[PDB]
């Protein structure tokens, strides 16, 4: 069932409606650039030329797959034209070739050609050595979860890194694809930034941070909810998602008011706990005292959820600047509970 389209769908993401890439450029599908023109009509005309119909900026999955496979064909020709990449590419099997193409999509041909030793190890079928060598790279440090899947593909020659996610990774994936990615990105008269502006103007208020703050504490909240000495709960912010079937569903994001002024101003914050992580913490509760195994497991899933979720948010241009992920110890050095209201107040004082 797996193939290079499904691979990049997982690693880079699939969009069936025009979106803006990291440079603001109109894009569709799996990263297929349409135009550098600022005109959405110009982008729609380039799309229509490429798909062969009036799409109005929306395409199907089969259309996106066809476009993507055209982009793979072009990447492969570039690889075969590149004296540093053709020999290793020729030597690899079809699955390992997909891994190399995956790197070329992420970092470009000249970036992949910088991995001279790793590529030689691959060409010599030294899979484990190449994998260790690749793990030491800045690529791995900046996108470790994608790099690990690609490295596993080089190491094994199988698609197995693209099968079912482990529990923490799958929790992050569902939380992003099923929730954050649907609620927050810009779209006609909706998404986080627009609805925050509507909210500010309806109540005559100002958000101190124009992002959704997501709290990933150590442990479930003391009473299972955010609490602070200096935050009061406000009316929630809403976005709307009209799915393919035409059903309008809301997303509600909690809003808090900072009860202590900061240079004369009251500030509001859209902020929530990372629900699937807190549900996991709740489920891990035992009526018996926790074992060291359970404490270790809680910490591992906490950290793995964060790294997967952080990477997804930051590598989708549409969400990168819309979320403030905060992972933190529930308690400071002196064993005192952290008050997120005071955290927010300090941050606003440093900002203003």
Author numbering: -14 to 337
List sentences from the manuscript:
Cyclic GMP–AMP synthase (cGAS) is a cytosolic DNA sensor that produces the second messenger cG[2′–5′]pA[3′–5′]p (2′3′-cGAMP) and controls activation of innate immunity in mammalian cells. Here we show that cGAS-like receptors (cGLRs) are innate immune sensors that are capable of recognizing divergent molecular patterns and catalysing synthesis of distinct nucleotide second messenger signals. In support of this conclusion, Hartmann, Imler, Cai and colleagues have identified cGLR2 as a second functional cGLR in Drosophila and have demonstrated in vivo that cGLR1 and cGLR2 have discrete roles in Drosophila immunity.
Drosophila STING (dSTING) is known to function as a cyclic dinucleotide receptor in vivo, but an endogenous nucleotide second messenger has not been previously identified.
